[PDB]
Amino acid sequence: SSPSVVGLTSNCVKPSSGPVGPGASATGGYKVPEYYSFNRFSYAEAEVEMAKYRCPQPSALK
Amino acid sequence: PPPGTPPPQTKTKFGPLADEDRIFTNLYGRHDWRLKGALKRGDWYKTKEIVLKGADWIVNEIKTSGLRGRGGAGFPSGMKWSFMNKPGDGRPKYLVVNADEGEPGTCKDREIMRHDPHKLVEGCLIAGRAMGAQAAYIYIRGEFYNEASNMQLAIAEAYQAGLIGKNACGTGYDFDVFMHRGAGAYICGEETALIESLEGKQGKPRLKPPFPADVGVFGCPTTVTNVETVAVAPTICRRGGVWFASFGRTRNSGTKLFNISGHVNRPCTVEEEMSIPLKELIERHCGGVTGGWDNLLGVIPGGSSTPIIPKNVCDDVIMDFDGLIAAQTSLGTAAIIVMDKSTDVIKAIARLISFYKHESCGQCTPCREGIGWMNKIMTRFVKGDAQPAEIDMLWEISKQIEGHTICALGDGAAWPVQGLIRHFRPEIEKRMQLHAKRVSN
Amino acid sequence: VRIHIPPKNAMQSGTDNVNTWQIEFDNRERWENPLMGWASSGDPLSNMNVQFGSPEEAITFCERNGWRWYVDGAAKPKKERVKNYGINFAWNKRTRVSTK
Amino acid sequence: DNLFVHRDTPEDNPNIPFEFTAENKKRVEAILSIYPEGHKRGAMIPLLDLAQRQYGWLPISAMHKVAEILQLPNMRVYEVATFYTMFMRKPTGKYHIQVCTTTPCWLRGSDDILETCKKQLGIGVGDTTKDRKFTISEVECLGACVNAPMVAINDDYYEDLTSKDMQDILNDLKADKISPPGPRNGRFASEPKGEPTSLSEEPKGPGFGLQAGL
Amino acid sequence: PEKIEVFVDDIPVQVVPGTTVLQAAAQIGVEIPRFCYHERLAVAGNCRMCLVEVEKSPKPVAACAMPVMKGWRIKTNSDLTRKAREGVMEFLLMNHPLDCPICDQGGECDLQDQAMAFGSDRSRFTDINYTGKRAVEDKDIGPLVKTIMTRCIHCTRCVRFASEIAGVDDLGTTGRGNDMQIGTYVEKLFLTELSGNVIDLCPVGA
Numbered sequence A: 001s002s003p004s005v006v007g008l009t010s011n012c013v014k015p016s017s018g019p020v021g022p023g024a025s026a027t028g029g030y031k032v033p034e035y036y037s038f039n040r041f042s043y044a045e046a047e048v049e050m051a052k053y054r055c056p057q058p059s060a061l062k
Numbered sequence B: 001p002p003p004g005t006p007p008p009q010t011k012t013k014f015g016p017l018a019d020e021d022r023i024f025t026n027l028y029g030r031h032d033w034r035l036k037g038a039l040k041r042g043d044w045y046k047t048k049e050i051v052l053k054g055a056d057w058i059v060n061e062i063k064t065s066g067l068r069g070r071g072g073a074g075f076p077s078g079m080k081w082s083f084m085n086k087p088g089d090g091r092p093k094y095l096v097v098n099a100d101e102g103e104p105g106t107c108k109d110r111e112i113m114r115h116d117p118h119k120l121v122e123g124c125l126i127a128g129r130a131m132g133a134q135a136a137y138i139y140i141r142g143e144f145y146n147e148a149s150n151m152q153l154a155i156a157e158a159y160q161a162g163l164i165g166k167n168a169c170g171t172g173y174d175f176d177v178f179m180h181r182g183a184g185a186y187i188c189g190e191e192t193a194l195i196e197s198l199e200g201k202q203g204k205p206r207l208k209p210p211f212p213a214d215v216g217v218f219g220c221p222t223t224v225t226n227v228e229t230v231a232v233a234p235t236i237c238r239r240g241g242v243w244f245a246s247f248g249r250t251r252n253s254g255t256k257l258f259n260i261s262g263h264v265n266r267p268c269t270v271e272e273e274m275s276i277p278l279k280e281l282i283e284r285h286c287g288g289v290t291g292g293w294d295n296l297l298g299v300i301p302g303g304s305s306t307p308i309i310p311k312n313v314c315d316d317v318i319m320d321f322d323g324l325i326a327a328q329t330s331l332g333t334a335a336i337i338v339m340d341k342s343t344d345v346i347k348a349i350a351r352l353i354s355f356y357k358h359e360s361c362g363q364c365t366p367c368r369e370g371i372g373w374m375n376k377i378m379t380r381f382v383k384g385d386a387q388p389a390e391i392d393m394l395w396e397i398s399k400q401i402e403g404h405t406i407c408a409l410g411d412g413a414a415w416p417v418q419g420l421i422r423h424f425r426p427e428i429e430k431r432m433q434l435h436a437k438r439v440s441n
Numbered sequence C: 001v002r003i004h005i006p007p008k009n010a011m012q013s014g015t016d017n018v019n020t021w022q023i024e025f026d027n028r029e030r031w032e033n034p035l036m037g038w039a040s041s042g043d044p045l046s047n048m049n050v051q052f053g054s055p056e057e058a059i060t061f062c063e064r065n066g067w068r069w070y071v072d073g074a075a076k077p078k079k080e081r082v083k084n085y086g087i088n089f090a091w092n093k094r095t096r097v098s099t100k
Numbered sequence D: 001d002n003l004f005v006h007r008d009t010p011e012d013n014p015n016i017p018f019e020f021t022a023e024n025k026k027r028v029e030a031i032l033s034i035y036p037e038g039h040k041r042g043a044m045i046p047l048l049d050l051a052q053r054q055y056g057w058l059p060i061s062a063m064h065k066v067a068e069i070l071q072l073p074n075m076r077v078y079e080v081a082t083f084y085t086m087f088m089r090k091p092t093g094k095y096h097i098q099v100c101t102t103t104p105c106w107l108r109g110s111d112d113i114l115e116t117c118k119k120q121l122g123i124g125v126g127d128t129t130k131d132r133k134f135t136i137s138e139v140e141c142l143g144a145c146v147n148a149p150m151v152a153i154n155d156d157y158y159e160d161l162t163s164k165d166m167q168d169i170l171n172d173l174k175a176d177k178i179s180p181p182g183p184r185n186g187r188f189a190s191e192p193k194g195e196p197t198s199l200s201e202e203p204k205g206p207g208f209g210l211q212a213g214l
Numbered sequence E: 001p002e003k004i005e006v007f008v009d010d011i012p013v014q015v016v017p018g019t020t021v022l023q024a025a026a027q028i029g030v031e032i033p034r035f036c037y038h039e040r041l042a043v044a045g046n047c048r049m050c051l052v053e054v055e056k057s058p059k060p061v062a063a064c065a066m067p068v069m070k071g072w073r074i075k076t077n078s079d080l081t082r083k084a085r086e087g088v089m090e091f092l093l094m095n096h097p098l099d100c101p102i103c104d105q106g107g108e109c110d111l112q113d114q115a116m117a118f119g120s121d122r123s124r125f126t127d128i129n130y131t132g133k134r135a136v137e138d139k140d141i142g143p144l145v146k147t148i149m150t151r152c153i154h155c156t157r158c159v160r161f162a163s164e165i166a167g168v169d170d171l172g173t174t175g176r177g178n179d180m181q182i183g184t185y186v187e188k189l190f191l192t193e194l195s196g197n198v199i200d201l202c203p204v205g206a
């Protein structure tokens, strides 16, 4: 698959552990386990992944 | 008709908002928020084709939509997105999406980022081409950590599907989206203050002019736009600007999110047609005030920075920009804060004044320490330890802070006290009068 | 006699106290007072000060009374200064401020 | 009691050593590569935030390290680190209980939650415990106003709390056992409690009601 | 370029485009009050003392920073402008520490002179008897410059100078709201050959 999620290091459950949080589940009424299943360094870890897809970028230099 | 001419409204009732007309179809997170889930909702549909129409075509749709900014100022978006379209410079161009959600009583921006992040990323692209921006930054609260990661997850999906990055959506247009987790500061939701934080400075609002369209992040043209404005940007293009203009009154088109918090039976967030009568709103989704409509004491139409309105005015208010201005109050962020009769209104307002005192950046003189004065005044009102003549003084101080500050936070902090004194002054006097008896006796 | 404009107070921004030309005499001797230590002087004109509208009048007044005079160079009108605000936030220029 | 002036302390002095871990160091390079070439001091807030997550709180020795990364005067970091509120410049411990107290969380009984938190832990507002495990601290508005009253614990949002269900959390956390976050009152997220009213009908799907002009 | 026409108190003036309202009124000879603006420092709009009315505009515009636009009718000595200045003085003088007898700046103080010329005569700050004024800790900047930070009005002249003219970048702003303070976070020496000039920029006795 091309659209792969952020590396499982940045997802706490890795990837399913039954219902989590207030009832959020993969097939439950509230289908968003990701929101309740992030590492404490999830946001920062994700940044290392996206460096590949982000193109070059401007420069104010002289 | 010129491109900037939304069709005149021709309806006399604005209450239903049929389900198919809802924009954010995944507001309550009942479906898959992933790319497969959103694709089944058509979020990334025909995005190539919209982009290749041309920036000028996209803007004229937006002016035809008559979409006014949801951020809280309400300045018409059409013009706002046209100032940055002027081709005058050879510097880069950025689109800063303001995902900050600082204003009390407002949760709407949190919804758009947990369960439809791809709608926001989608909207960045369409808005990106309209401004011709080389990249977009998403500024998110520090406290919204999980949402940021959730938003980050959606962005990574977009990159792998080829929707953004090099050859975004196969249009030949190069676009990169970035996230910037600002630390906790309510002031950072102000356009220029936001631009300063992204530059890494302290984060104090700048003066205008120069406006962001000339100098913005890193001194380059930028357009600071709220998430709801962006998230609706693509669905306007898909479903036509005229369709959106159908809803809302003549100069107040569009659907709006209403976070109805406070003493209500069933507080929640609900998309509803703007210009709906307020009574029809509270008793349609939220199950009415706790003690029935008779226990209502007044509401704050737009969260803090909105003058309160008493019960009698609420009988006939219209939840709309023009409609509320008639009631000496502003819609703001559309967040309603209902207040039962069993509520110390003085203590409720005094909290908000204390809130602003904690959030003033301190840069400019009135709000730096003029608010520090009202905070001291309002504290003594709560105890009733004040002379009745102080009421007019407190009215007087507010007039001095309004319009003399750099940003609109100062203007915000003055509206609550003016709404309080203008409607519940008799109650304030009674509290003082009791304080005289108990202390004297 | 020294025709001059009184010097602006560096410790203030107001200026309407330097909108005149003046005459002040030479700064003759002073000495400690033997008894109490006050400042003493035998210089009546040292106390003196008069105001004028232009040096030409000031010279005219000085000539009519026989005083010897010399004029301090009139401060040239300050060159125009741009003082733009937007340049504080510049993309590639050094004028960008690191503070706020 | 927070001060905006740094005084030498055993817990917080510049001679303390602090360094980004090899894991975190690779993240710094990713962060710095996000702002234009000449304007990299915009990474200061990400870096300062990334510093305290590795440390719990933000020492001064960390502040210098960020400045060394960006090659700036040391004070330009101090201004930024002192402006924003979640940079804890004094030790915080492990759990930093974030209790909203502004309207409308105040309207829906927030004072009770604050009172019970102090009683259960026997500390004052804006203060830490002896073990540096809990640090109760009021906050202003966490943007969860709809699901009020609510508390946040270091990243999380425990919404729709009361006296009973809150002490359940503290009893769990004091037992070192993780607890479920999210709303407690049988509502998944920001939905009107009970039967739904909107969005019950299926999403229409792609292509509905298009302009037909592309 | 071509001189733009602007009227200050209904007196026409010619100014090159880009000129600030404060500079434009200087040509007539009108001196708008100022605290944060200094002629040799970067423009900031902190003090808001320079506020001035403009015909047909929603609100006062900071004279120091507003670039003149053609056709305007600036109104320095109008009722709206006078009220604005009175408001800010009433605001600046809340927390000033009541030190003029023991303050070196006395008799040379901008906050004094501009209070007389523009500010009101009374004080409405009833809260002296309940919660008192603000008081800020002092700073040890060195052997040359004494520092009494409770008198600071946060004009940021000192900060702008040290960053722009001396180029030391050791002074700055910390905190927010009323608890904002100017000074080094960690005690240091403001060591520069030009250090003295700060003593002249600070319009108050801080």
Ligand SMILES: Cc1cc2nc3c(=O)[nH]c(=O)nc-3n(C[C@H](O)[C@H](O)[C@H](O)COP(=O)(O)O)c2cc1C
Residues within 6 Å of the ligand: B068, B069, B070, B071, B072, B073, B074, B075, B077, B080, B098, B099, B100, B101, B102, B103, B186, B187, B188, B189, B190, B191, B224, B225, B226, B227, B229, B407, B408, B409, B412
């Ligand atoms: C003190 C203050 C805080 C603000 N916070 C926000 C915010 O959190 N989210 C937002 O969208 N606009 C906020 N605004 C409004 C912005 O200044 C601006 O109007 C808006 O972001 C522009 O986008 P819009 O067209 O959707 O309104 C704030 C303004 C002020 C003065």
Ligand code: SF4
Residues within 6 Å of the ligand: B187, B204, B205, B359, B360, B361, B362, B363, B364, B365, B366, B367, B368, B405, B406, B407, B408, B409, B410, B411
């Ligand atoms: S009004 Fe308040 S927040 Fe806005 S610039 Fe002035 S001091 Fe800062």
Ligand code: SF4
Residues within 6 Å of the ligand: E096, E097, E098, E099, E100, E101, E103, E104, E105, E106, E107, E109, E110, E111, E112, E151, E203, E204, E205, E206
């Ligand atoms: S700085 Fe303050 S205390 Fe000193 S002379 Fe001026 S007004 Fe008085």
Ligand code: SF4
Residues within 6 Å of the ligand: E151, E152, E153, E154, E155, E156, E157, E158, E159, E182, E201, E202, E203, E204, E206
């Ligand atoms: S110390 Fe003096 S110069 Fe610096 S901000 Fe305060 S009043 Fe202005």
Ligand code: FES
Residues within 6 Å of the ligand: B104, B105, B106, D100, D101, D102, D103, D104, D105, D106, D140, D141, D142, D143, D144, D145, D146, D148, D150
């Ligand atoms: S008032 Fe508590 S989350 Fe907003």
Ligand code: FES
Residues within 6 Å of the ligand: E033, E034, E035, E036, E037, E044, E045, E046, E047, E048, E049, E050, E051, E062, E063, E064, E065
């Ligand atoms: S002189 Fe203009 S705001 Fe200070």
Ligand code: NA
Residues within 6 Å of the ligand: E105, E199, E200, E201, E202, E203, E204, E205, E206
């Ligand atoms: Na001084």
